[PDB]
Symmetry: D2
Subunit: 384 residues, 4 copies
């Protein structure tokens, strides 16, 4: 099969909750379950048709055995469904979609689901096994420990971004200008109904139906903030992604599978892949994966109508756009992780699902998402 | 490409350590690093040639950001290497190999490594985020919580095995006879040098060069033990797999990649896949995945020379053999997880690597490994 | 020396804070320090004159080394001051005063301070030393563990009170009537300025100057509440004492010491002592200690103008009054622990200090306070 | 009464166990129970005659409600018995005896028990109440937190001793010579049967009948050790007291009570008291309390036949002896806390009970014990 036989037939996501707020105490598996129910409904695919699932999640500690399996069975899929979880840090939700696409192209399955999820609010603290040391010991926070602290450099992802920003003269002022644009774009998109196709609401009693993060902004305060990660840094709490909860899922099949069940293909796969570099330099990895997947698709930069370059920090889209010569009016046009937030296992799936829904038929979209350890995932789709 | 273009060029593993013993306080990332270095040496592949890695690991809590990445960089691979972790419970090490095979068949990479790892000794305890409730709360053990307790039935994997055993009249005595055979087969294999090709030793100061579990047996005591999981049960500490630490890796390429680099293919891929059923019934899933992968390879039961059916409990090989009509003299002939131990992320890779080394040229081997949540992975290879 | 040579020259207390409210995160040592500064100021005694201190505190875990010493040095006393802490559960603050009185009567010191303190809000959770058990373990709440759970019966103090209430036909209705009277008396006393002599305020920024608990009442809801401790119980959250934070201190000397420093004796000691019975029956112990200290003072029930019978539960003053034939109009006339709250190490000192301030000159007051394990302290003073 | 009317009629103690060794996991209340039963048996006093108890214990966290009460009821005393715990750090066991003596002299009771206890092995770790902070927090060790760290200087008691040693030229070599003498004196006393009168054994299954610490010595290694507390320090693990478990109790009455019950007085009280100085200087406090209690008894240094100056560190007896001009052949003649160990709540009672048994009729003994926060207790008795 050619890669273009792989089609997306549905996509949905939860709202993104703010840290310890809307989805406080809501396990990641609940979020994933509701996103998957939503995606299957969007696809008009009954859960019993799903043969296999790949779900990204980075720090599922204390969510119980096989949280990806919990999601799939919770969404009503049959126990015959095959399920795997993947962790590629913030690329997890995209890599899950890639793995699903690979088994479809090899005709190993016909109907598959994929996506990503994270509850950063529910990440626990750790105590090591064995003898508690005389004199006491640290209760370890799983978020920096397994999520956000670089092992090799022993500094947070944001401090890595400070390094890249200084090296490439990406100023505090440019980062704040970009952050403001992201917040304003997120608000405009919500007002225009842009997310209506892709959002499913949750009851928690309250009903959560809107992204929580993007109203949490004070434009006048942004240039006044102190550096958040290093003493002479440029990255701040306003121009960095936030800690968040959410899930995003897609339903994928082959052209034959769609015909067989009378489904409407929403988009098709053109290319996917990954690139990596030094851990501290994850911020430049999207600029390497993008040419790689363009080449796989037989396309050039001018052929992409919309870019989703995950806003890990304002630093990353800024580096990527300037280094590759991208038009900012075609990049992250409905906001991104700086203003919508960043449940790390979710975001890679969210930005792909967003392109599936928001591209006009015929248009091509490219998503690129950097990840801890120095990587980035890339993916190109064509709207149908 | 055809699946038969996918070839294994190397395989290696650490010894398996017993719980809180040989590899006590040794992070999973150290174990995986040494297994990966060993596999690359076995393949005569310089680490700089590795383009992508998939590594299985089930409960990596508190091992730091991106433990699979830590392994790959620790082993000397270039920062350009693409890395993903996978969790399919005890099938993780096998599913990783499958994912690697898929991208090789699609010509998305040429040189890939895959495997699995677990340090059960280093799994931590959890405390949830937020208010410790008045009256106190439970400090949670990550091993049952994220590893071994079934979410849906709220019983341990061994209690699930008790259920399957009683349903299908797999007696305590049959389970004990199988357990004794496994311990004896493990000791005989060690004495005969069977594992010399696949083992790499580790310095921990001690040198660990031998599987620690298989000498921890008293044959006369085995029929005297009480049930380990349920009051009227048949599963015991002796006829159940143990808790362990270890890692296993393989190096994979295409027939063209092997030619290009002057490498000797050891084995080729014939088929891989997965099946699943009700979570409590994971023990019967290997009996479903085996016919599935036989059909994918165009083979019958008689065409397989060696079976590796992971010994999660003696129950599982016994059910599988009697349901499919397998010859026990061709099943788990050098022992298995009851006597060698079961680092859950490792075992699916171990049993495939074992077939790569121990099959005679021209022979075909089938590996099947059940997993929490109701699944099993399957794989068939042919020795060259 | 006769006991009547022992005189009180000052007394002060903090407001009582509600659980995890006004004094949340304020260590017990801060509360004790401010109460002791206040008492010394009330006495017109410079801190350098204090020779010895006894301070009651029941659960000082994690308050650091020698919290009683911390209080004394924090209040400005010289390092030459001798300091001891005592724990007699809820009798601690009274027993501390008794011990101080004993060394004054023996002329072993001339100027001493005594009192009680507790921060129930700051009591920690416990994890035992050594190997954390496989499968997890309980994080133990210090409040029930070291404060409120009876060791012998393995039930809470309130469940003990249910037992005594049922045995002596002290009804739910009588307990609620008493609880209402306590809340109304507390409010009336605050409005009338009754506590103005004895209270010192604290800055925490906010200024805490009033008892927090006594406004936390809904009179209409009281008869509607469910039992709080046992399924068919009579004790409820409204008619039981609450969990609270506070400290109370007194300054004591001999008649000669007062003359020497030109101090005004506020009251003199007539008798003190203790009685005890079966742990579950602590509620009847005040009725035994009262005749004991009356006999020591050469007095009868009619000779006491005011009674302070600590309101551990409404059960306890009710039992005591009816069994001894006391006039309720002379008992706990300005409220008590049901409505003002009950920092367990404090209350014994509070009720004595209250009598020191609120008796008219010439009048005699008797304080009696039951305690976990089956005890009660008693004390009689004469206002001067 | 005169102080000389107060008589000791019995004394006993557990062996002292080494940290996490003989009495590992044995609650302090068990140790105190057995010591109290033993003392009552030594006195030939039936437990039902005991009217009141004072028991010292410094860090009873997680030992349950009212551990002193648990000891008294566990020993078979009547529920009518009045019970109080006291904490004066390492003076607790002595101050308890003082408090008992005071109420006997005032004729408030006739038959009283007193002593001290500690299980340092069972001291727990602490987690504060409320939100675990983002980023994690310290699991606190109760031993330094509530036992051994000075609050004001934020250094351990051993670091305070380093300060006193350097200020007064008490050399490493002098401290080591004293430590060696203590270990040798302890071994000689054990061999000579010195402790046979005062020890009661315990079943834990093992029988513990001997002090565990004094054989844990290597004389040749002592001068080779590194400082234990400060980089340029003189205090080492060998010349400092150790962490230990144990309990010691006495039975006390008046000359009239002894006559009434046909008991033999063993010793009489001559004086008791306390002194204090700056917290870091607790090591010089015994040199202040000794002249104080000598004056109270109308005695001089030459009138004392045996000194028990608690060996918190070798520093403390050395300072005391040279400052007061004491004859070392009369000081700690059967070893002390450096070689026998130092359960902090126990030791003040142990050294007084030891004098009760080991003094010859007509001899006078003085005990002095320093304590955290800057204090020392002192006591003088006369053997009958
Ligand atoms: C490797 C590939 C990747 O994807 S890396 C990305 C992974 N994710 C991350 O690294 C998450 C990084 N983010 C964080 O760690 C947190 O959000 C950080 C930066 C630490 C901020 O947390 P925290 O300090 O708790 O936030 P805060 O809300 O209290 O803000 C601090 C001060 O800044 C202000 N602030 C914040 N946002 C805005 C805004 N949009 N507009 C105006 N002001 C803002 C807050 O008001 C606050 O101010 P103040 O100090 O209280 O006065
Ligand atoms: C879903 C797909 C899957 O892969 S499921 C499988 C995943 N893994 C698991 O589920 C791990 C299951 N195993 C376990 O949980 C533990 O190994 C269990 C069964 C609990 C045993 O742990 P534990 O009780 O600590 O072991 P233990 O060594 O103290 O043994 C208990 C008593 O039995 C004995 N015993 C043990 N093994 C043998 C043997 N081979 N021969 C003779 N005797 C044996 C021990 O001597 C011990 O005896 P005793 O009670 O001390 O007298
Ligand atoms: C041995 C000698 C001694 O001194 S023994 C005494 C030592 N101290 C103790 O034993 C403390 C005993 N008290 C306690 O343990 C707690 O205060 C108990 C009883 C458990 C209550 O705690 P908690 O359940 O958290 O309180 P809550 O405020 O949520 O109340 C529960 C429901 O009752 C109500 N309530 C309470 N007080 C009143 C009142 N004064 N008037 C009207 N209603 C009241 C609350 O509104 C609450 O109602 P709801 O269930 O939320 O609808
Ligand atoms: C304020 C009034 C007071 O009463 S203050 C006193 C209160 N109590 C205290 O302060 C307790 C002070 N003691 C302690 O904290 C511990 O005992 C300290 C000093 C920290 C020692 O603990 P730890 O380091 O675990 O001991 P350790 O047995 O491992 O010994 C360390 C090395 O020294 C050696 N050592 C020890 N004792 C002896 C001896 N008697 N003869 C010869 N050698 C000795 C050990 O062999 C050990 O050597 P190595 O480093 O393993 O080679």
């Amino acid at each position: 099969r050619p890669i273009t036989d792989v089609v997306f037939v549905g996509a949905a996501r939860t709202p993104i909750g703010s840290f310890r707020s809307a989805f406080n105490n809501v396990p990641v598996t609940v979020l994933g379950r509701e996103a998957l129910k939503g995606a299957l409904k969007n696809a008009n695919v009954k859960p019993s048709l799903v043969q296999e699932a790949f779900i990204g999640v980075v720090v599922p500690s204390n969510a119980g055995q096989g949280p990806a399996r919990q999601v799939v069975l919770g969404a009503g899929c049959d126990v015959s469904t095959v399920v795997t979880a993947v962790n590629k840090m913030s690329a997890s939700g995209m890599k899950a979609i890639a793995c699903a696409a690979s088994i479809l192209q090899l005709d190993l399955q016909e109907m598959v689901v994929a996506g990503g999820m994270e509850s950063m609010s529910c990440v626990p603290f750790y105590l090591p096994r064995g003898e508690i040391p005389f004199g006491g010991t640290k209760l370890i926070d799983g978020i920096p420990r397994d999520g956000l602290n670089d092992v090799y450099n022993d500094i947070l992802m944001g401090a890595c971004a400070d390094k890249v920003a200084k090296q490439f003269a990406i100023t505090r002022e440019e980062q704040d200008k970009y952050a403001i644009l992201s917040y304003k774009r997120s608000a405009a998109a919500w007002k225009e109904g842009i997310f209506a196709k892709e959002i499913i609401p949750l009851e928690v009693t309250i009903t959560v139906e809107e992204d929580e993060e993007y109203k949490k902004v004070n434009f006048e305060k942004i240039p006044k903030l102190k550096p958040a990660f290093t003493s002479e840094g440029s990255v701040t709490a306003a121009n960095a992604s936030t800690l968040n909860d959410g899930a995003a899922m897609v339903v994928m099949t082959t052209v034959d599978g769609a015909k067989k069940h009378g489904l409407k293909p929403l988009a098709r796969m053109l290319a996917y892949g990954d690139a990596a570099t030094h851990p501290i330099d994850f911020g430049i990895a999207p600029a390497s994966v993008i040419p790689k997947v363009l080449k796989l698709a037989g396309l050039q930069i001018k052929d992409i109508d919309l870019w989703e370059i995950n806003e890990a920090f304002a630093v990353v889209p800024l580096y990527t756009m300037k280094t590759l010569g991208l038009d900012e009016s075609k990049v992250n046009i409905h906001g991104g992780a700086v203003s919508l937030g960043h449940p790390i296992g979710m975001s890679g799936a969210r930005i792909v699902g967003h392109l599936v829904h928001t591209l006009k038929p015929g248009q091509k979209g490219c998503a690129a998402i950097c990840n801890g350890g120095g990587g980035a995932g890339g993916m190109i789709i064509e709207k149908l």
